[PDB]
RNA sequence: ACGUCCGUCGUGAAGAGGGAAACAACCCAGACCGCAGCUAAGGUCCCAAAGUCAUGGUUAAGUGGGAAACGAUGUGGGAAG
RNA sequence: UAUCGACGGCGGUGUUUGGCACCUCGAUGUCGGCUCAUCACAUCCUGGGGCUGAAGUAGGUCCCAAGGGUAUGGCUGUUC
RNA sequence: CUAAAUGCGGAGAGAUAAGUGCUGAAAGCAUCUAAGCACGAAACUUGCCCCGAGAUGAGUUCUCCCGAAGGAACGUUGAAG
């Protein structure tokens, strides 16, 4: 069980004696039924599924191992009914969050940040903005220069512009686990978590805390 | 064909394209594969192709040179004596990295290739000995190379440099 | 005019082999690759699958002509130009054989044109009898 | 100067056919229909019909020839003091 | 011979001008600007180097290299 | 919803040129080369983000299914358009 996964519910907060008041993001972490686990290998730098472990297959778990010893194994995802899990497959695949999750423990939560169509350079890849009177010239979120040397009237592919997005993966580290509570088996993560509500976020023991 | 007599303190055995020389200092195995057949006679190693083409003489001059090199490197060995000098700030040369070169705060170093010993006694002389020749020559050359003024400052004014005393 | 069997051609799926062992590599390019679309049966048309998976015995002993060596070269790679050539010798890539008698019977797609699909059919590999061990159905011998 | 302006001649214009990768005037060559045969030009590894022909030698650059004035112990052959 | 560099000689480009006039002459809206897209380099730097009349610093000149960056304004419609 | 608002946007690894060297001949010396070899550029490849089975080596997995499994039509609303 390299980690668990839940669905973002929203953002709340819990004032704890130790530490100090800090917003907490509620995440629904519940019953799953992992039938198999797909393992990827790092051939150069292009993910490829080595093998898949079923309810009973020592011929695939063996390759999974060793490859891990070779450190060539990539991210691990397994055919699941609801959400993922690792060593959970070997048992029966049926498990609850209570089995994997403790509080006050550090965890790395990654996820795809929240279709928005085309956006302006600024609202887009964080481009700053026309500070100074530049803003007064109502030219707020515009680079003002598509590219140097009008000739070519071309914009260097580099010279970042506007485009499409939405519909970026980010793995924030050191996310303390406040507690596991709510109407349903959920999780309280300190601070905020990438992605919108309902989005699928994964948990993983902090690589370095 | 160029017969090469072998010293009394040298024993060479060949199996195919592989030639192994044995002695006191150590052993060195080398591979010589070309349009020629190198064989070892009880008292002499023979090298003699069938054709006398230019390219054939080229591989003949190097082969004999390489063999003779494997002989000396087993009876005598390869060692280079180097000495450090510095007018002003003493350059501390350690088995790891040299420090305080000309007064620079950052140390200048170079990775020691292969497996040779560069024992440096706390004085002016240091020694770099090994079994491989291309290795003992590279490390010795690089040690002086880094002592070469990187900035656009000519020599003469900057004496500090660890040159090789004997080859 | 119209005579097509139910979808597709996989049930009771045919299959054929050859003796990659000894003989010209040229006249091995043809055949095999003609066992696919229009194997030579009254079940062609052409728009659905046919690819009749073939098998290769040993691809290591397969010797070429006694004249052409570092004469023919294959350019394998993709991406930017004027960078990596990756021009190796035939009897150099012989370290295999896995990617050889499949590099051929591979050049005829011609360009999607249904041919991508055509590849996983055959299974090139060096060996012999205990090589056809994989894939387990009845038996022939051309 | 795919320039003007003359002269001789052959052609473009009524030259088809064939070669030259494609091509008005470059090379061969000049036609009724149908049929058989042999050649011209050109070509004979494959696409493409025909030798992946024979003896000998040179080049390694893939040179496969804009490519110049100019330069060149890259390399081969020959002669002379 | 760092750098500058005559006389003379030999060339490349074809952006200028001149020439010819072979082509078009059975009509493809002007100049400048603006807006927007792609390509090139005879690199002004950044990067790695050579020389210096190179102490250092700051420069001058030259080589490889264009990957990116090479981008703006005041007067004038004005291109010097 | 927006902005003169706010949070986020690496490092590292690999390979040649100029060039610096090693071993080493043709010219038994010498020589970075001619065979071989150690290093060596912001750029290049990769990392990372986004799209993507019409990614023509045209994908993978599980289950259901060949007279009944499954599926389309409708109604009430949108974290949708």
Please outline what is shown here.
Chain B has 2 helices and 11 strands; from the N terminus they run E-E-E-E-E-E-H-E-E-E-E-H-E. Chain B is of the alpha+beta class and 167 residues long. The radius of gyration of chain B is 21 Å and the shape is elongated.
Query: What is the helix content of chain B?
Result: 10-25%
Largest sheet of chain A: 6 strands, antiparallel
Task: Give the neighbour order of strands across the main sheet of chain A.
Answer: 8-11-12-2-1-13
| Shape verdict of chain A | globular
Shape of chain B: elongated
Total count of helical runs of at least 4 residues of chain B: 2
- Major sheet strand order of chain B: 1-6-5
- Helix-strand pattern of chain B: EEEEEEHEEEEHE
Based on DSSP secondary structure assignment, what is the total number of beta strands of chain A? Answer: 13
Radius of gyration of chain A: 22 Å
Cα distance spanning the termini of chain B: 31 Å
Question: How would you describe the overall organization of this protein?
Answer:
- The structure is cut from a larger assembly and holds chains A (209 residues), B (167 residues) and C (142 residues).
- Chain A has 209 residues and is mainly β.
- Chain A has helices spanning 58-67, 88-91, 97-100, 133-136, and strands spanning 5-13, 23-28, 32-33, 37-43, 46-53, 73-77, 94-95, 106-112, 117-119, 163-165, 169-179, 186-190, 200-202.
- The two termini of chain A are 19 Å apart.
- The relative contact order of chain A is 0.25.
- With 167 residues, chain B is of the alpha+beta class.
- The radius of gyration of chain C is 17 Å and the shape is globular.
- The chains hardly touch.
- The structure holds 3 RNA strands.
- Chain C: This is Large ribosomal subunit protein uL13.
């Amino acid at each position: 069980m390299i980690g668990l996964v839940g669905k973002k519910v929203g953002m709340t907060r819990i004032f704890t004696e130790d530490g100090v008041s800090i917003p907490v993001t509620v995440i629904e972490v519940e019953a799953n039924r992992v039938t198999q686990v797909k393992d990827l290998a790092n051939d150069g730098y292009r993910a490829i599924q080595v093998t898949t472990g079923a309810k009973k297959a020592n011929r695939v778990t063996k390759p999974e191992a060793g490859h891990f010893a070779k450190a060539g194994v990539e991210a691990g995802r397994g055919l699941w009914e609801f959400r993922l899990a690792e060593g959970e497959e070997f048992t029966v695949g049926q498990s609850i969050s209570v089995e994997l999750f403790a509080d006050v423990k550090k965890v790395d939560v990654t996820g795809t940040s929240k279709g928005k169509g085309f956006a302006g350079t600024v609202k887009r890849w964080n481009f700053r903005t026309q500070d100074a009177t530049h803003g007064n010239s109502l030219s707020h979120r515009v680079p003002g220069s598509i590219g140097q040397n009008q000739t070519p009237g071309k914009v260097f592919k580099g010279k970042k512009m506007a485009g499409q997005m939405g519909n970026e993966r980010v793995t924030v580290q050191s996310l303390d686990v406040v507690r596991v509570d709510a109407e349903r088996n959920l999780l309280l993560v300190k601070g905020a978590v990438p992605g919108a509500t309902g989005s699928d976020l994964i948990v993983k023991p902090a690589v370095k805390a | 064909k160029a017969p090469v007599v072998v010293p009394a303190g040298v024993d060479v055995k060949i199996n195919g394209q592989v030639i192994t020389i044995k002695g006191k200092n150590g052993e060195l195995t080398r591979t010589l594969n070309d349009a020629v057949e190198v064989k070892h006679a009880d008292n002499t190693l023979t090298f003699g192709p069938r054709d006398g083409y230019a390219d054939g003489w080229a591989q003949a001059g190097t082969a004999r040179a390489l063999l003779n090199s494997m002989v000396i490197g087993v009876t005598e060995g390869f060692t280079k004596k180097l000495q450090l000098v510095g007018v002003g700030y003493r350059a501390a040369v350690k088995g790891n990295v040299i420090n305080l070169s000309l007064g620079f705060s950052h140390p200048v170093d170079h990775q020691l290739p292969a497996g040779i010993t560069a024992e440096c006694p706390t004085q002016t002389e240091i020694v770099l000995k090994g079994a491989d020749k291309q290795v003992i020559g590279q490390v010795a050359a690089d040690l002086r190379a880094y002592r070469r003024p990187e900035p656009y400052k000519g020599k003469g004014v900057r004496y500090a440099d660890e040159v090789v005393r004997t080859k | 005019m119209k005579t097509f069997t139910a979808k597709p051609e996989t049930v009771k799926r045919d299959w054929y082999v050859v003796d990659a062992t000894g003989k010209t590599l040229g006249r091995l390019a043809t055949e095999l690759a003609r066992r696919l679309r229009g194997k030579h049966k009254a079940e062609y048309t052409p728009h659905v699958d046919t690819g009749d998976y073939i098998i290769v015995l040993n691809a290591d002993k397969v010797a070429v002509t006694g004249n052409k060596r570092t004469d023919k070269v294959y350019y394998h790679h993709t991406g930017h130009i004027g960078g990596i050539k990756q021009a190796t010798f035939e009897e150099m890539i012989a370290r295999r054989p896995e990617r050889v008698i499949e590099i051929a019977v591979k050049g005829m797609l011609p360009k999607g044109p249904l041919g991508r699909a055509m590849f996983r059919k055959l299974k090139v590999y060096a060996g012999n009898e205990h090589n056809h061990a994989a894939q387990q159905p009845q038996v022939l011998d051309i």
